[PDB]
Amino acid sequence: MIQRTPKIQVYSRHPAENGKSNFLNCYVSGFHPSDIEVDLLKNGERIEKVEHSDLSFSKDWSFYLLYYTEFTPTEKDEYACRVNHVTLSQPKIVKWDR
Amino acid sequence: MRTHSLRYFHLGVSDPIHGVPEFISVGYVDSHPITTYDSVTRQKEPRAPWMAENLAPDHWERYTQLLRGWQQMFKVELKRLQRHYNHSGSHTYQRMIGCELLEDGSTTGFLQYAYDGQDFLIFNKDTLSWLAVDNVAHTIKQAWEANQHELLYQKNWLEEECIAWLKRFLEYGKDTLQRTEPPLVRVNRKVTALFCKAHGFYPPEIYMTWMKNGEEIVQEIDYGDILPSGDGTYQAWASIEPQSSNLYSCHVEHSGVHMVLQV
Amino acid sequence: QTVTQSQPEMSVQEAETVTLSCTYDTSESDYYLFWYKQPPSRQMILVIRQEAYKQQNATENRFSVNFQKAAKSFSLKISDSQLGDAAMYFCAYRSAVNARLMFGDGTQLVVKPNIQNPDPAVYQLRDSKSSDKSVCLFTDFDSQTNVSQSKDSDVYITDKCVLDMRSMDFKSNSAVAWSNKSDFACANAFNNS
Amino acid sequence: DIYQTPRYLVIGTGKKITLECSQTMGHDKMYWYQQDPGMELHLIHYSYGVNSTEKGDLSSESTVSRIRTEHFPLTLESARPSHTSQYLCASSEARGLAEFTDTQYFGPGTRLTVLEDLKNVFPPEVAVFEPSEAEISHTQKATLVCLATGFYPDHVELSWWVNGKEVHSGVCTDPQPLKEQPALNDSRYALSSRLRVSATFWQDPRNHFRCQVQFYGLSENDEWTQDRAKPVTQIVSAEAWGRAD
User: Fold this and answer.
1) Where in the cell is it found (chain D)?
2) Domain finish residue from D73, D90, D116
3) Does B117 touch chain A (CB under 8 A)?
4) Which of B76, B93, B113, C130 could cross-link with B121 by S-S, CB 3.0 to 4.6 Å?
5) Cα–Cα distance between B154 and B112 in angstroms, integer?
């Protein structure tokens, strides 16, 4: 299998304003095969309650989902998305900016 | 009245781990999932309130059987592909069928297969022939190109039934599909760099740029992708970076509306 | 999801054209239409095939169809009928997405031969064994004649039956009757008919 | 093309029945319909290929298996009277799509009859009635007539043998039989056939005529406690020799 590595994008539904409740989004896409593991990270720990869209198909034979979780950003708090795929020999952890 | 599209995708996976279903198939109108089948449920089901409400239990029953059929066929084709390629682990086979209705009323149609996420077989409805990547595909195309009725059914569905169904679904989901939600466009700052950011819009197709003191276009423009915000809307951004000797401005276009912003 | 063939019985002269009639009901647009014939063998035999995505009406030599899509009408046209054509004919619809071939109720087609010189006659035949039991044969009657079945219970009248002696190039309608009762002859066995 | 065994089967209530259907056209899609006297054909089982077995419009206590491409057998565990029907297997050529773009070809079918009491089954009595001088003199032709009587159920196949060869030209067999006691429902049956030849040909005494009736009846593991001989599968035949006279 000539596989494709997952592209990970992490962002919030509504523009971040500390104190305002929101949704944290992780967009994993462009990956082949289909089997994929995803966790969202607060301060480096697993968020535990997390929803995910049903696996979706692109025309170029890659897949995509959206992992998401209802959160309130505290000025102190750091957030990331960590994925693992056969294509990755180590977990890829992409931090949330802003 | 904008370009819309109907697509049904099939995916098969040999020797899948506990979770992965051996077969999944999914229908889509412009990225809105409308239908779903898998190997555990062995049931075609609506993935939208408006599909569900508007189709009698027969449609789902009838198409469930048809998809039970495809399940079976993919299981088999997979083993034959292995036998021919001398394969060994979990592999994927995939098929995508669908049509596009352009704003100008003309149409497109598409049918394609893939082994391990690489183009295997591409259908051509004007010449009633497959094109194949290697002899394995060629061999299985030969048999297929023998059956003339199958060749023709495809051309028809693609050129006729697919569109009829699109038109129905568009209507059926008008409130969500033919809707227009305009964006929030804003400018933020950050070597000094400025970002035109837009959010909470629909449909996702959006165009953004920067215009040098309104005159020309900045050549050096980093474009954020267009991403789904969570709620049915999409968000996207565009960035550029000398005391600003010429004051700049953002130009955006969504659903027919050319929008502009100064700083 | 439904087929109707209203003509339960139908008739034709040898070398004549006949039209068998059939309508279907559906809402599907992508579909398949067939005729099949079931001789007394009870074997279903394909006669012709028409796909809803085709205007030109199918033709298999002597057989052809009138496909009026908008009328949802699908008539089988048999030219130059032959005795062999005799059978039950069935109209059938199949969706492109379901397997059940939906069948019409069926139209029975009888072929009348061209009796060139009628020579209506009733002959009697006897047992090659006991020579006490006997039968009656009505035959070489014109094809426009009909045979009443017996209203009496203990007398057995068979149906009209076409025979083709290809040896001698000769066709022949025939019908047989029997009974054990003594007050019974050939002369009057077919008189009610 | 496609084969189905048996073509006729009479069996007692509650015994295990296996109707065979086989095909050698390389057809993945296969079907099984059921036609009760009058009622229309009903898809009861179908298959998309090896190890597919799906149900159809009408619901059934039969079962099917598809271990391989050529065979699609149908099994009936506790066989009951209501199962009495004609079962038609079939096969289609679509292979590259799940969709049904093909034409279904049927096999010849199996006339099943399941009976509560096996004492209603009887083999036929065959008798050849020889031609008539009346006819011979009038027409130059001789019509021999066969009469199969007293048989039940209607599992019978009649044949005309001239000089040890089965013949086709010159024959008319009632497409359907008659009830001997039309009054009843379990009424026995009587069928008639006609063989017509030359007067020349019937007058040659070297010429042998045999009317043969094949009857499909009880088999070995079936039970029978009755004076009437067990009405097993058998041929019942009757003959007549040409006569110069």
Assistant:
1) Cell membrane
2) D116
3) yes
4) B113
5) 12
CA B178-B184-B186 angle, to 5 degrees, is 150
Give B180-262's CATH code, choosing from 2.60.120.10, 2.60.40.10, 2.170.120.12, 2.40.50.140.
2.60.40.10
Q: What is the full DSSP assignment across B123-135?
A: EETTTTEEEESSH
Contacts of D104 in chain C (CB under 8 A): 94, 101
Q: How far apart are CA D211 and CA D199, in angstroms?
A: 19
Q: Are chains B and A in contact at 3+ CB pairs closer than 8 Å? A: yes
Nearest to D174 among C36, C123, C161 (CB): C161
Resolution (A): 2.8
Beta carbons of B198 and B208 less than 8 angstroms apart: yes
Please determine, looking at this structure, whether the domain spanning A1-98 carries the CATH number 3.40.1180.10. Answer: no
Spell out the domain ranges in chain A: 1-98
Q: Is residue C138 part of a domain?
A: yes
Structure token digits, residue C138: 């009505």
- Do C137 and C56 lie in one domain? The reply is no
Whether residue A13 and residue B117 make contact (CB cut-off 8 A), yes or no, is no
Number of domains in chain C: 2
* Closest alpha carbon within chain A to B85: A1
Cβ contact B164–C29 (<8 Å): yes
Question: Is B199 near chain A, with CB under 8 Å?
Answer: yes
CB pair distance less than 8 Å for C163 and D194: yes
Sign of CA dihedral A52, A57, A60, A63: positive
DSSP B136: H
CB pair distance less than 8 Å for C42 and D109 = yes
Question: Which of B187, B194, B186, B189 is CA-nearest to residue B220?
Answer: B194
Please indicate, yes or no, whether residues C34 and C67 belong to a single structural domain of this protein. Answer: yes
Secondary structure of A9-67 as H, E, C letters: EEEECCCCCCCCCEEEEEEEEEEECCCCEEEEEECCEECCCCEECCCEECCCCCEEEEE
CATH class of the region B4-176: alpha beta
Residues in chain D with CB shorter than 8 Å from the CB of C172 are 196
Structure tokens at B128: 């009633």
Any long-range contacts for D174-181 (C-beta under 8 Å, 24+ apart)? D174/C158, D174/C159, D174/C161, D175/C40, D175/C159, D176/C40, D176/C159, D177/D148, D178/C156, D178/C158, D180/C156, D180/D149, D180/D150, D181/C153
Under 8 Å between Cβ of D167 and D207: no
Asked whether the beta carbons of C173 and C143 are under 8 A apart, the reply is: yes
Is B161 within 8 Å of chain D by CB?
no
Pairing of strands D208-215, D189-198: unpaired
User: Is B150 close to D101, i.e. CB distance below 8 A?
Assistant: yes
**Between B and D, how many CB-CB pairs are < 8 A?**
45
- Enclosing domain of residue C27: 2-112
Closest-CA distance, B125 to chain D, in angstroms, reads 15
Mutate to test the interface with D, among B10, B25, B65, B74 (most CBs of D within 10 A): B65
Contacts of B65 in chain D (CB under 8 A): 54
- Answer whether the bond into residue D6 is a cis peptide, omega within 30°: yes
Are C104 and C125 members of one domain? no
Please report, for the domain that includes residue C157, its CATH number.
2.60.40.10
Solved using: X-ray
**One domain, residues D68 and D174:** no
Are D100 and D210 found together in one domain?
no
Nearest CA in chain D to C177: D192
- Residues in chain A, overall count: 98
Taken in order B71, B73, B75, B81, the sign of the CA dihedral is negative
Residues C9 and C79 in one domain: yes
**Whether residues D56 and D151 fall in one domain:** no
- DSSP H helical ranges for chain D: 133-139, 199-203
